[PDB]
Design a protein around this ligand. Sequence first.
Ligand SMILES: CC(C)(COP(=O)(O)OP(=O)(O)OC[C@H]1O[C@@H](n2cnc3c(N)ncnc32)[C@H](O)[C@@H]1OP(=O)(O)O)[C@@H](O)C(=O)NCCC(=O)NCCSC(=O)c1ccc2ccccc2c1O
Ligand SMILES: CC(C)(COP(=O)(O)OP(=O)(O)OC[C@H]1O[C@@H](n2cnc3c(N)ncnc32)[C@H](O)[C@@H]1OP(=O)(O)O)[C@@H](O)C(=O)NCCC(=O)NCCSC(=O)c1ccc2ccccc2c1O
Ligand SMILES: CC(C)(COP(=O)(O)OP(=O)(O)OC[C@H]1O[C@@H](n2cnc3c(N)ncnc32)[C@H](O)[C@@H]1OP(=O)(O)O)[C@@H](O)C(=O)NCCC(=O)NCCSC(=O)c1ccc2ccccc2c1O
Ligand SMILES: [Cl-]
Ligand SMILES: [Cl-]
Ligand SMILES: [Cl-]
Lengths: 275, 274, 275
Amino acid sequence: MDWHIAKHYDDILYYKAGGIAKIVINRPHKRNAFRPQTVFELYDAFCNAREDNRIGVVLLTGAGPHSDGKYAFCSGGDQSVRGEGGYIDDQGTPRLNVLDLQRLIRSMPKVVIALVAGYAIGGGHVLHLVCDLTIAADNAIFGQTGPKVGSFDGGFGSSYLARIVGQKKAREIWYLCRQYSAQEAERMGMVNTVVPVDRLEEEGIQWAKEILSKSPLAIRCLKAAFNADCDGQAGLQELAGNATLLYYMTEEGSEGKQAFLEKRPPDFSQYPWLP
Amino acid sequence: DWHIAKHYDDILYYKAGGIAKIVINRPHKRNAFRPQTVFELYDAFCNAREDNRIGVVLLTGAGPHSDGKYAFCSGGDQSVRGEGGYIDDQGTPRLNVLDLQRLIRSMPKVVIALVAGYAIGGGHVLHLVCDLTIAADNAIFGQTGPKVGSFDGGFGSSYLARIVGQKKAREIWYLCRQYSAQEAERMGMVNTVVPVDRLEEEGIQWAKEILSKSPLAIRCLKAAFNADCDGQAGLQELAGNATLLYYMTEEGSEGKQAFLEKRPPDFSQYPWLP
Amino acid sequence: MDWHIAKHYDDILYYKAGGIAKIVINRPHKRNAFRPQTVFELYDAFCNAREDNRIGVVLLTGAGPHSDGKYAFCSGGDQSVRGEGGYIDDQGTPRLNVLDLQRLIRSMPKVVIALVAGYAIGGGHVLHLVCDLTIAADNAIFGQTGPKVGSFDGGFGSSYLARIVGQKKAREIWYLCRQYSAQEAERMGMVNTVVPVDRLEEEGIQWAKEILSKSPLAIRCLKAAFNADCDGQAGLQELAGNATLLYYMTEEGSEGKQAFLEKRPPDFSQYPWLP
Ligand SMILES: CC(C)(COP(=O)(O)OP(=O)(O)OC[C@H]1O[C@@H](n2cnc3c(N)ncnc32)[C@H](O)[C@@H]1OP(=O)(O)O)[C@@H](O)C(=O)NCCC(=O)NCCSC(=O)c1ccc2ccccc2c1O
Ligand SMILES: CC(C)(COP(=O)(O)OP(=O)(O)OC[C@H]1O[C@@H](n2cnc3c(N)ncnc32)[C@H](O)[C@@H]1OP(=O)(O)O)[C@@H](O)C(=O)NCCC(=O)NCCSC(=O)c1ccc2ccccc2c1O
Ligand SMILES: CC(C)(COP(=O)(O)OP(=O)(O)OC[C@H]1O[C@@H](n2cnc3c(N)ncnc32)[C@H](O)[C@@H]1OP(=O)(O)O)[C@@H](O)C(=O)NCCC(=O)NCCSC(=O)c1ccc2ccccc2c1O
Ligand SMILES: [Cl-]
Ligand SMILES: [Cl-]
Ligand SMILES: [Cl-]
């Protein structure tokens, strides 16, 4: 596919083609671990994709293979910049800004697909989970390490994982910190499909296209609806927000706006009280 | 064996022993429901709810059709769809399947979807809200909303996610692909798969295993499962059953008699248990 | 492994070795059914394990094989002592005290692993479910019987089961009261791994050891986090409670304590308001 570069970053690469955007984590020397900068850039890129009216689907993946032949989606938080209370940015401030990225991916009204080749570990594992869909290469390796490396993600990393693979498997994943193959990840319900490494991107594009032929309004409403099963009032905000969006496309709704601007009482008398 | 219980235009309705059977009968539209179909379905389920002998309802689609094809339900009849809903005979737009969803979900009888061939769109959601699903090996499952300009962001989304998990639920809705009976079982939304010509017999077999159980235990469990999903509405069903059971106690009856006899109640004999 | 007896009980056995405790239900004549006393002792043992700072993992299992060659994890509430409103203890009081045990297993900040050989039925099934993890022998048999024997567990027995195997299977389990093999139990997501009968304990020990090499603080926080997806404010209590525990290890927190004891206003001016 004709990928065009959309913006230049230090830690990532960002492209667009038709209704598809592609974001690539580009720190293969650290198994694509994110440092605070990486997250800022990821945030910026996803935000860009959110703002682009032509983009309906974002493919997220890791740069590879590395000089050692190994693939990686993301290895999570860069431990070489970790200190007191978080990951230290260039200015000395401790951060856990991936939490903001998690929220953006989760709430943005575009479908996000993780394309996992090789390692999706730790925060990189949580990143794949929060994407709407996951397509794995048959060399993909999934797991958490928190309790081994002195961390934990007790937010979407735990609760949301449990809403994917159930409570028994979710706990196993976190407590033992083992590694799981692509086939195991699919069997437990956290990977949508598995393809050969050299077919990964093409599968991503194929899935993106099947989505891009759908109604954008139906898709955004559904995404909000799924979030509403998890995120209480925050979820209701997204779902009700879309109801308001749709209501702002009605004649009935516009009558209320015009009435105010024209400084007259609104006339809703023609509109029925449906069952 | 099956005795007809009431006559309808769009559906068929039978009863035998503790089992009722409701059949969507519009095979010319792959058993799509129009507002009338829903009214009749509602009426039939309500009837089944009211019948003290009925413990289990089997829900299925009429088939095979003249073209040899099977269908459970294809969802909302798009040929009667207009502004704001599906237009009934009287011109009023409706989404009354939402009421049917609620009745199936809340009624204290076990409802089993028997899916042969297509369970698509609103027909897919209908199978989901039934307590159990038994599929024929020719069954085909899927959503189409984002393709045909619709969506079910209620039980169609959230409840689906409580069955197959969030990853698969989203795939189902976003891509609108079709899934085989075997795939549907593997992902957790179908309870078992049998050959087409064994579907009804399997339904009857499952119904019978349920019919030999305590009706009180079953209704309490169904409410309990709903309570994990439906907040205060779910608590209403569950607490409601607690009240029903409390109205079978001597302690509870003392309170009633005391009021009717215009005297203060005496609960002093009853302990405050741990 | 060198198991040392830790305390004597009538209905159960209790051992400890390294960071592992083992609790065994010992009433094989009733397929390890629990009577009120059994629950009291189980509670006491788990509570002991909770109090022991060396113990990080508890293995729960049933005594066997029985004289008839049959294995059992637990067969649930002892129906021979069941009367009006509950299971009658030795003093005549009806009880459903297993509900308290369920809560202790679920909330205690140690990982609990059910090792299921043969029958895990009824309340014994629910007991396996509330344990964090389940390892089954390939002879394991799982199921509920409530609607057959005039009972039901509409608490963790229903809702939590549904958070493991999904709503369709959970309902099947309860409505039909069939039996399910170890392989079926794994396939539906309620068993973490299946091993041969004579490997069950060794697998338990192996899993326990992989957990015991992890950070205890990370593990307790994760366990609370998983409970928070299910138990509303009770879940928030456990999770927030751990946040308080961690806050009580900070210098910032200690300044507040010292200020009060020294009868002076606290000085938090040096501490930043992080993003
Ligand atoms: C699982 C691997 C993907 C690959 O193994 P492999 O053997 O193939 O290569 P390896 O030698 O281990 O690594 C390759 C090189 O890249 C480095 N590297 C790999 N992954 C990371 C990494 N994640 N961070 C820093 N460096 C990394 C390695 O150190 C090494 O560098 P080098 O020795 O050449 O100098 C492995 O490297 C590994 O164990 N990585 C560590 C995973 C990890 O512990 N992540 C942190 C847990 S917490 C997490 O991600 C996270 C993040 C944000 C959070 C925010 C709020 C709340 C919670 C958060 C959270 O839990
Ligand atoms: C996937 C099939 C099951 C069957 O394939 P097949 O190729 O074998 O059949 P087909 O080619 O369509 O031919 C069958 C005949 O039956 C008709 N038919 C089948 N299903 C429907 C139908 N649902 N409505 C109207 N006509 C239908 C076809 O038009 C056609 O008639 P013909 O062209 O020969 O004159 C396919 O036909 C199909 O996509 N049918 C339409 C499914 C559909 O998208 N329904 C609406 C989605 S939403 C829905 O049901 C719904 C309902 C209520 C809701 C309420 C609140 C919120 C959301 C709701 C909701 O999302
Ligand atoms: C699958 C078995 C579990 C095994 O069959 P098997 O044929 O191999 O053994 P079996 O011959 O039937 O039984 C062996 C001996 O142990 C006895 N036994 C086995 N299980 C139990 C048992 N659970 N209670 C009392 N006795 C039991 C048998 O009666 C028999 O006694 P014996 O004739 O030698 O004198 C079977 O024994 C059996 O179905 N046992 C009954 C299981 C059961 O119904 N438990 C009660 C469901 S409800 C429950 O556990 C429960 C508990 C607390 C709750 C608290 C709050 C809310 C709900 C609760 C709740 O639902
Ligand atoms: Cl981790
Ligand atoms: Cl649909
Ligand atoms: Cl039971």
